[PDB]
Symmetry: D3
Subunit: 161 residues, 6 copies
C-alpha cells in the first residue's frame, strides 16, 4: 500500500529515535576527515566496523552461493583493511538497523572510495530487516586499496510511504 | 508528467495481470531454497534462464561496444553456469517484460549472490521497453562463482506516477 | 522537508534553463549512433569528455583514499580511451552540473557499455553540488574495452520534492 | 658423459641419421631458423592451443581436459596475457639412444616476456616437439608460425 | 671443466658417497621418479607453501614475509592460477665439492604451464631442495606429493 | 664440443681477453656478485623497464612498442605481480668466437617467484646483457640495483 519516496533527515531521525531504526545514531555529520558519518540531508552515512573478510583464490574452490566455505576468505581485524586488487572484502556496519515494515533501504558508496575503484555491492534492505549490514566492497582497481574502520563507508537512502 | 515513486506488490500484480507487464508471473514467493523468485513487497524477483555467455580473453580483441564480437565470449547452456574469476556473464531472464509508457524499472541483486562478489550491472528499463532482460553478472571475486538457472537472480523495482 | 521522487523531463528542462542545473543542455536526444545524449523521459544522458585517467599497477603503491597519488594512473587525452581489463578509468562529464538544495541525483550506466562489463560507479550528487561529474568506469571484463569521448556515457536521474 | 655438440655434428646426424627433418644447414630468415654454431633453431608450426579459464576446471596433469584450451590455426597466434600456448615444431626429431636435447628460447621472444618451457628430450625420443610458450607479460603477445621459435642444444 | 654425467656415475655417488638419499636405481611409477639415463627424477614431498596476495605486501627477497603464503600439507597441492608454490624434495642431497646440479621440469607438468624455477645446486651443497613451481596458466593446476616432480642433471 | 668451464678459465679470459668487465675474482657482498666456482654472478644495473597493460597493445616481437612499459631508474625496482621487467647487467661482456654462455637465476630471487628468462649468449656476442625478470608471483617483488642478479655459465 502506498508507493515509496526517498525520505529526509528529519524522518530518518524520528525513526531512529522512536523506533530504534538505526543504533548507534548520530544526528549530524561527525568524525574527522573526508570519511565522516552520521545523518545527511537524505540519508545516513554508516561506519565500517573493524572485522573484515578478505577473499583470495588460495584454496581453488568454486564458490557456491548456496554453501558458504571458510576457505574462500581470511579473517582480519584492525583499524584498516587493505583490499587486494581485483578482489573483495566483507565487513559489517558499526550501526545496527531495524527496518520498519513500511520501509526499504538502498545502499550507496562514498565518493572518496568510489573514485579509487571501490564498488559497494550491498543489495536493498527489505521491510522488517534487522541486523548489522554486511558491506561488500569490491576493489575493481589493479592496485590494493586501503579502507578505514570506524569511519564512514557508505550511505543508506530510506524509501517510505 | 508526474514524478515517480517505488510501487508496491499490488500495483505490480495489477500491471502484470492486466497489462502483461511481467510474464510468466507468480504472485508470491516461490521456489525451493534461498534463491526464491516471484512477487515481493516492493519489487519482483526474476529468474535466471539457462543460456549464458561467458567472457574470456582467449582471442585478444579490444571490445568495441558499438560492434559486438562473437570472439569475446563462449556460449554455455545448462542448469548452472560458473563465472570465472574477475570476468562476467550475460544471460536473459526467464520473465518477459512489457514496461508501460508510465514506468521505469531498476534492477538490483540478491544478497545471496552479492555477498559472493557478484555485481548485477543491469541499467534501468525505460518506459515502453519490451523483452527478456539481459542480465550482466560481474564476478568481482578472485574465485569462480556458481549461478543457478531457473532460480531467483535479481530484483526489479518499479517506479511509476 | 518533503520526500523525493524521480522527476520528469519537463522538470529537468525547467531546472536546466532557469536554474543552470545542467550546462550545456540539449532538450532532446542528440548525436549519431547508439551512444546518444541529452534529455530523456526521466533523466539526462551525459557525455564523456576527452580526458581520462587510466589506472595501472606499475608503481606498486597501496592506494590510500585519503591521499591521492599520481603514480596510480596515467593521463590520456583523445577521442576514445581503452580501459584495460579488470581496471578502471576516471573521466569528467562534458556537462557542468549545479544541483539545487532541493535535489539529489543518481547516476546509472547505458546498456551499450554495461553489456560489455563496464560498471559505472558514480555515487549520488548531493543537494548543492556543483561541478563536472567525475565518472568512474570499472572494466569488469577480462578484455580491454573502448569508450567514446563526446558521446553518451551515463544517465542522471533527478530526485526532488 | 655428455657435452654440447657443434654444428658439424648436428649436420652429420641430421643427414646421415635423420635426427632433424626437414633440415637446413644455415640461418634462414629477427626470427631465423636452421643450423646455428652450437644448436638448431626449430620452427613453430601453425596449430595452437590457447589456454583460458572459461570453464573453471582444476587442471589435472594426469587427466588433461579439452575444456582448458581453444584450438587455433593460422600464420600467427596471440598468446593472452598471463597465459600460455601449446604448439608443435615444424621439424620432426629422431633423438638417438646416444643423445639428450635441451630447449631454449630465442631472445626476440624472451625479451617480450615469453618463456619457453620445454623439458629435455631424452635419448631415443622420436616426434614433433610440443612447445610450451608461457606469456609472463601483462599484455597479449604475438608469435609467428613457420619462423624460428626456440633453439635445441644437443648433448652427447 | 664439467659435463653431464650418466646414470652409472650418479649410481656410484648415490651409494658410495650418499649424494642422493633415498636412492632408487630405476624409474618407479606419467610421474615416475628415480634414476634416469642421464639424471635423477626427484619426488615432491607433501608440504607446500602456496602464495597469495591476501595481505598486500611487497615481497622483499632480503626479508621474506610469512604473510606472503599459506602452508598446506597433503597428498596433492593445487597451485592457484598465475601464482606459485614452494615445496621440498623428498630426497636429501649431498653435492660433492666436485659437482654442480641443474634442475629441469617433467614434461607432464610443463605441458600444463608449470615452470620449475630451481637454480643450480653449487658444489658442496647439502640439503632437501626447495622446488619452486610457477603456475603460468590461467587455471589452477594439481601437483602430486610423493611422485616425480623434476629431474636433476649432474655436471662434473 | 663444449663443457662448463671452471673459475680459473673465466678468470683468465676476463683478464687476458676482457670477456667480462668490470671483473671481480671472488664473491663480494644474500645477493653476492663476482666469480663463482663454475660461473660468474653479474650485477643488475639501475635502469629498468617495467611492463604494464595500460595502453592495451598486442605486443609484436618484430615491432616492439614504447607504450608497453615504463622507464624507471633507482637503487631498486618493484616488479608488479604477474608482470616482468627488463634491465641490463652492470657488466660488459665480450664472448669469444669460442664460447656460449647460459644464464641462470639466483636462489634468493627464484624463491620469490622471479624467473630469469635470458637466452644464451652466442659465440662472438659483445654487449651489456638484457636481463628479463618475470615475476610469477601474485605479489609485487623488490629487486636490487648493483647487487647480484644472475649467474652466467660459460660453455667452451
Amino acid at each position: 500500500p502506498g508507493s515509496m519516496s526517498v525520505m529526509p533527515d528529519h524522518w530518518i531521525k524520528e525513526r531512529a529515535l522512536k523506533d530504534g531504526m538505526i543504533s548507534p545514531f548520530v544526528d549530524h555529520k561527525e568524525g574527522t576527515g573526508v570519511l565522516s558519518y552520521g545523518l545527511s540531508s537524505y540519508g545516513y552515512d554508516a561506519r565500517l566496523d573493524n572485522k573484515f573478510k578478505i577473499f583470495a583464490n588460495t584454496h581453488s574452490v568454486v564458490v557456491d552461493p548456496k554453501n558458504f566455505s571458510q576457505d574462500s576468505f581470511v579473517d582480519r581485524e584492525g583499524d584498516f583493511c587493505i583490499i587486494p586488487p581485483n578482489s573483495f572484502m566483507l565487513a559489517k556496519t558499526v550501526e545496527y538497523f531495524n527496518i520498519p515494515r513500511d520501509v526499504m533501504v538502498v545502499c550507496v558508496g562514498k565518493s572518496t572510495y568510489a573514485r579509487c575503484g571501490i564498488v559497494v555491492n550491498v543489495t536493498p534492505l527489505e521491510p522488517g530487516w534487522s541486523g548489522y549490514v554486511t558491506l561488500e566492497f569490491s576493489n575493481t582497481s589493479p592496485l590494493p586499496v586501503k579502507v578505514y574502520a570506524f569511519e564512514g563507508a557508505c550511505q543508506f537512502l530510506f524509501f517510505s510511504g
